[PDB]
């Protein structure tokens, strides 16, 4: 009936309005920014006990100081991840220094809306992407956490939650968060809310957690340390 | 810059109705007739002008392609002209490569390939014309027919246009295999005469022949003598 580019009586871009609805059917993720680093955490949502749980990777590493956590169409997110990696490596090659979380979020947001079906390119996209992202990292100003939408609007947050239970996850994050946290209380509360909202039982193989801090690199939690933390809680 | 999708598609029963409709268009042209004899072929058409104002000499329906091939049509004239032009080009390319005159069967195959290309490309309709090809090579006369779809046959006596059913029903009876070219002309003319609704004249019809010496369309002075009998 319509084309892909078609405003509505409210100027809304139907296809983007649908790609946004494609996100309320994903598994919840959570990021939180502290004065000592950032932490990301996402539910794995295992289907049946025959599926290997070490094969669900929803928190990848963009560079030695930036990590990403996605939700939506994990098949779509991979081109974005690849292009972000390539851009960071190009910036290193040219300027002999590390890129910034702001610049990476901005360069990735410029691929959104670049779709169409006539006089676009030799091989071009035919629809918008269906993935929301969450970047974290440290740079010359400290820990930062950004958020990206399929429309191409990126913001800077300190505690954001994306997914199918976010309208309930933020209602607790806004009460829990304060400007005087430490990363440890951050991790504890980020686990408590997950447990609060999930459908299964929060054990040490159906979740994921990583952290970046001014001293170290991007580091993923182990089934040893993770288990200890869960048990400790 | 042009459409890229097909305009001819399959139907729930497997038909191609655009080709069926191009055939319905062909079924409403003017009658054509071809008859292969022991030493030549004969093409005969109905060139009936709308009114006396039209200058008859300017436009012809029986055209040559090389020194030994000629064809007629039924259907749509503006499409017939495109087909004639491309057939002439095809014959010239063959002669350029092989330094030999093209045979009638190769000519018909290449023309039918073009007509088939116009059933599966993007944003075009099929031709609304069927052809009747004539030729002579290696001591033998040929006579083919090409359809709007791209399928060609080989005949001894056929008929196109309006009233083709009765045309071939009458054509089957008289046809002999020993028939000379001069006595075949009478049958070709007579077949046309069955459905004319008028009076025959040296400007109502066109007639072309092809024998050992090449293709040529008869002149009205000769059509007069042939019509006298």
């Amino acid at each position: 009936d319509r084309g892909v580019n078609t405003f509505s009586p409210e100027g809304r871009l139907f296809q983007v309005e649908y790609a946004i609805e494609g996100h309320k059917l994903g598994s919840t993720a959570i990021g939180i920014q502290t004065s000592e680093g950032v932490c990301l955490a996402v539910e794995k949502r295992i289907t049946s006990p025959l599926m290997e749980p070490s094969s669900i990777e929803k928190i990848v590493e963009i560079d030695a100081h930036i990590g990403c956590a996605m939700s939506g169409l994990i098949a779509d997110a991979k081109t974005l991840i690849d292009k972000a990696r390539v851009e960071t490596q190009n910036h290193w090659f040219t300027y002999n220094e590390t890129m910034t979380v702001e610049s990476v979020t901005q360069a990735v947001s410029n691929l959104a809306l670049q779709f169409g079906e006539e006089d676009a390119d030799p091989g071009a996209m035919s629809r918008p992407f269906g993935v929301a992202l969450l970047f974290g990292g440290v740079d010359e100003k400290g820990p930062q956490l950004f958020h990206m939408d399929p429309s191409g609007t990126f913001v800077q947050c300190d505690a954001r939650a994306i997914g199918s239970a976010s309208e309930g996850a933020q209602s607790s994050l806004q009460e829990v968060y304060h400007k005087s946290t430490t990363l440890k209380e951050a991790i504890k509360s980020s686990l408590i809310i997950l447990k609060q909202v999930m459908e299964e039982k929060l054990n040490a193989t159906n979740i994921e957690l990583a952290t970046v801090q001014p001293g170290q690199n991007f580091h993923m939690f182990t089934k040893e340390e993770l288990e200890e933390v869960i048990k400790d809680i | 810059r042009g459409y890229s999708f097909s305009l001819t598609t399959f139907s729930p029963s497997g038909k191609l109705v655009q080709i069926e409709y191009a055939l319905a268009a062909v079924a409403g042209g003017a009658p054509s007739v071809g008859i292969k004899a022991a030493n030549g072929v004969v093409l005969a058409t109905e060139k009936k002008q709308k009114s006396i104002l039209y200058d008859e000499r300017s436009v012809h329906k029986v055209e040559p392609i090389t020194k030994h091939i000629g064809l007629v049509y039924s259907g749509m004239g503006p499409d017939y002209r495109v087909l004639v032009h491309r057939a002439r080009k095809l014959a010239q390319q063959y002669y350029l490569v092989y330094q030999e005159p093209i045979p009638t069967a190769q000519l018909v195959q290449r023309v039918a390939s073009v007509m088939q290309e116009y059933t599966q490309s993007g944003g075009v309709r099929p031709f609304g014309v069927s052809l009747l090809i004539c030729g002579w090579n290696e001591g033998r006369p040929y006579l083919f027919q090409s359809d709007p779809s791209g399928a060609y046959f080989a005949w001894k006596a056929t008929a196109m246009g309006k009233n083709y059913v009765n045309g071939k029903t009458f054509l089957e009876k008289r046809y002999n295999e020993d028939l000379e070219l001069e006595d075949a002309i009478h049958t070709a003319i007579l077949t046309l005469k069955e459905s004319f609704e008028g009076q025959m004249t040296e400007d109502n019809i066109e007639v072309g022949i092809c024998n050992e010496a090449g293709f040529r369309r008869l002149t009205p002075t000769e059509v007069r003598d042939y019509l006298a009998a």
Binding site: - | Y3, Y21, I52, L53, S58, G77, G123, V124, G128
Partner: protein, 240 residues
């Protein structure tokens, strides 16, 4: 009468009868302007006449012309849509110049007509564009035959004539000219201007003034295409 199935009346595809309705509509577009042309060829001359009805008197009527020059010895008269006809005249001029450049001599009238006709046949086949809604008439002197008069149409059909007539009153304006090719070769002498003006006036009842027509001329004595002046037109009109 003729049924329809699908997108028949919107694009150039066959109807269940093989009729191409979208080309029968450009013929009706021809009758939109509201003019009428008449061309007559004689034993040594070809003549064009054209109605000249300007709407009201603020236009510079020295610019409202339906007569055009293609080469020195070829002239033309259009009927139908104005901008379409301008584009067709430009195309004919380019074709006529390219022929001379390629082959060293001047293009004949029938060759030019056939070129324009096969250019239009393509609009009848591809579906992304529309046919041009205009007719064309050409005249000229052939060094071998003499006077020639040809006419195209939006379908790609390009017959040749003894005396044509295109426009709104085509049928009756040709029914009149039918009766006069009986004898005397339709007055085959330089005064076929009389025949043309009479045929244009008989079914219009205007008895035109000295400036509501345009006439053009080619002759065997002088081959170039000339446009006769108002005084010359007036003298013929006065004689009538």
């Amino acid at each position: 009468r003729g049924s329809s199935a699908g997108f028949d009346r919107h694009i150039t595809i066959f109807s269940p009868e093989g009729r191409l309705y979208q080309v029968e509509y450009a013929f009706k577009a021809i009758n939109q302007g509201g003019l009428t042309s008449v061309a007559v060829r004689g034993k040594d001359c070809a003549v064009i006449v054209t109605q000249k009805k300007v709407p009201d008197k603020l236009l510079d009527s020295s610019t409202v012309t339906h007569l055009f020059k293609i080469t020195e010895n070829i002239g033309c008269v259009m009927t139908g849509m104005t901008a379409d006809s301008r584009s067709q005249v430009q195309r004919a001029r380019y074709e006529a110049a390219n022929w001379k450049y390629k082959y060293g001599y001047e293009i004949p009238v029938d060759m030019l007509c056939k070129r324009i006709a096969d250019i239009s046949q393509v609009y009848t086949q591809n579906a992304e564009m529309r046919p041009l809604g205009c007719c064309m008439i050409l005249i000229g002197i052939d060094e071998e035959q003499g006077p020639q008069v040809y006419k195209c149409d939006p379908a790609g059909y390009y017959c040749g004539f003894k005396a044509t007539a295109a426009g709104v009153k085509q049928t009756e304006s040709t029914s009149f000219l039918e009766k006069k090719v009986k004898k005397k070769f339709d007055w085959t002498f330089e005064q076929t201007v009389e025949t043309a003006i009479t045929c244009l006036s008989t079914v219009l009842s205007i008895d035109f003034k000295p400036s509501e027509i345009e006439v053009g001329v080619v002759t065997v004595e002088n081959p170039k295409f000339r446009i006769l002046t108002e005084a010359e037109i007036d003298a013929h009109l006065v004689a009538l």
